[PDB]
Ligand binder design. Structure first.
Ligand SMILES: *[C@@H]1O[C@H](CO)[C@@H](O[C@@H]2O[C@H](CO)[C@@H](O[C@@H]3O[C@H](CO)[C@@H](O)[C@H](O)[C@@H]3O)[C@H](O)[C@H]2NC(C)=O)[C@H](O)[C@H]1NC(C)=O
Ligand SMILES: *[C@@H]1O[C@H](CO)[C@@H](O[C@@H]2O[C@H](CO)[C@@H](O)[C@H](O)[C@H]2NC(C)=O)[C@H](O)[C@H]1NC(C)=O
Ligand SMILES: *[C@@H]1O[C@H](CO)[C@@H](O)[C@H](O)[C@H]1NC(C)=O
Ligand SMILES: *[C@@H]1O[C@H](CO)[C@@H](O)[C@H](O)[C@H]1NC(C)=O
Ligand SMILES: *[C@@H]1O[C@H](CO)[C@@H](O)[C@H](O)[C@H]1NC(C)=O
Ligand SMILES: [Ca+2]
Length: 400
């Protein structure tokens, strides 16, 4: 490599058979990342806009950033970033709007005047990120995620508010869509920041940042509950397993049974009534009217992205890390094994489905001396790249 970048905190530990390298540093707050057609890495640097890193590639993890330009300067862009399959359009989001920009791959420039607003009316308080995903199987379909306005948001009970949900938009048909004009992929999703497509079948998957301060029969159980969730939303362009309500704010998934008041026949993975559920809602109601997660993960690990490998055998998820637990959790990259039907190989009650790929050597140091993984992407040869927003870093990760 050109440069020898090193981390400034006790370094991530790779599982056996993996290796990594830090390749960019001094970014402000890097969120979503994607490759352009010319081998450049586009970085949604929150509060700055979209930056393009030029990389030199000597094979394996031997990559070096040789240059960087700001393609789009806009301080409102806070997370979401996508690029068309032909490479000629960039989509990026603010709290309120999803913009499309023409991207000139001959120059590697974007003319600001080319900006059009494709989706709008998304603004709300608290969860302000708007994850963008373009389908591979249906390349005209743009998915957009949008969280709650508060930890327990009552407007998430009203589907027309557009809070706590994922929408799909046919961009080929485009005066922006209104947020709630899109096909409904899911609602009752508090903050499903990570959304991905499994190539095995085009199955749509999201990962949930579930509720804080969880009380159960008035007892505080927030330390180990509720679960973070892997949720399944069917395939794009069909309604099976899609558009349902995944619980929030009425129902939450169970991670840890021990010391859980009013367990009943509840198992790991099953949802239960929130103490603050609307008048009438019970556990049976959670069981019959709301869509359960397909897997759960350790409470508060805070997943932010999910990406599958070319073959669909494995998904990789970023765990950005807990902020409210006495002993912190997350601060890792994990993988989840998937089968031929495009479902996880683990049962929905498993507590061991997340396999560690890259971890913080000592959780007691986090957040302050730990990476906080956010964005993931694959290059053309299957190498995995990821962002760490709080340390201003980009890493490459691969099997050795
Ligand atoms: C259901 O709704 C209730 C009511 O909003 C939520 O209760 C909140 O629980 C937290 C405990 O984590 C309370 O915070 C604490 O308040 C006391 C004062 O009594 C203070 O000494 C503590 O340091 C802490 O700030 C919070 O006040 C309470 N909120 C209220 C009464 O407004 C509960 O978390 C919700 N249940 C869920 C999300 O499962
Ligand atoms: C993007 O490019 C700029 C231009 O080279 C880099 O800015 C230099 O950064 C180093 C940081 O150690 C300074 O010593 C130089 O003075 C900077 N030069 C200028 C002209 O500002 C910047 O580091 C690059 N950023 C990333 C994230 O790669
Ligand atoms: C539902 O959502 C829309 C939000 O725009 C609003 O017009 C309506 O009054 C809301 N409340 C309901 C149906 O309870
Ligand atoms: C946003 O919603 C408001 C209603 O509050 C409406 O005036 C406006 O037409 C919407 N914008 C678009 C582009 O749909
Ligand atoms: C798919 O991807 C991974 C990485 O190449 C590999 O370990 C796995 O064996 C592959 N599966 C199939 C069915 O080819
Ligand atoms: Ca749920």
């Amino acid at each position: 490599t050109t440069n020898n970048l090193q981390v400034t905190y006790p370094a991530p530990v790779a599982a056996d058979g993996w290796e990594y390298r830090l390749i960019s540093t001094g970014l402000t707050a890097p969120r979503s990342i994607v490759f352009d057609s010319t081998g450049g890495l586009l970085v949604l640097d929150a509060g700055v806009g979209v930056r393009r890193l030029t990389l030199q590639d000597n094979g394996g993890t031997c990559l070096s950033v040789t240059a960087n330009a700001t393609l789009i300067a806009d301080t409102a862009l806070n997370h979401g970033l996508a690029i068309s399959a032909d490479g000629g359009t960039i989509y990026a989001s603010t709290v309120n709007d999803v913009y499309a920009y023409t991207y000139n791959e001959q120059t590697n420039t974007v003319d600001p005047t080319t900006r059009r607003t494709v989706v709008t009316n998304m603004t709300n308080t608290d969860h302000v990120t708007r994850t963008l995903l373009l389908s591979s199987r249906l390349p005209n379909e743009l998915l957009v995620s949008r969280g709650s306005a508060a930890n327990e948001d009552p407007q998430a009970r009203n589907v027309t508010s557009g809070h706590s949900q994922i929408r799909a938009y046919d961009i080929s048909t485009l005066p922006p869509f209104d947020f709630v004009a899109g096909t409904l992929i899911g609602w009752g999703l508090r903050d499903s920041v990570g959304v991905g497509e499994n190539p095995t079948n085009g199955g749509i998957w999201s990962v949930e940042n579930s509720v804080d301060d969880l009380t159960r029969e008035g007892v505080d159980v927030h330390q180990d509950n509720p679960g973070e969730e892997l949720n399944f939303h069917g395939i794009l362009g069909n309604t099976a397993n899609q558009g349902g309500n995944y619980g929030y704010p009425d129902c939450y998934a169970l991670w840890s049974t021990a010391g859980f008041p009013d367990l009943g026949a509840l198992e790991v993975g099953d949802q239960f009534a929130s103490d603050n559920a609307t008048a009438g809602v019970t556990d049976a109601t959670c069981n019959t009217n709301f869509v359960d997660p397909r897997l759960v993960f350790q409470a508060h690990v805070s997943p932010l992205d999910i990406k599958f490998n070319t073959n669909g055998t494995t998904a990789y998820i970023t765990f950005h890390g807990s902020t409210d637990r006495t002993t912190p959790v997350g601060y890792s990259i994990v993988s989840v094994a998937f089968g031929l039907n495009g479902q996880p190989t683990s049962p929905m009650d498993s507590t061991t489905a997340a396999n560690n790929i890259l971890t913080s050597p000592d959780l007691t140091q986090c957040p302050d001396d730990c990476f906080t993984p956010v964005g993931l992407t694959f290059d053309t040869i299957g190498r995995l790249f990821f962002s760490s927003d709080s340390t201003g870093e980009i890493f490459v990760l691969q099997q050795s």
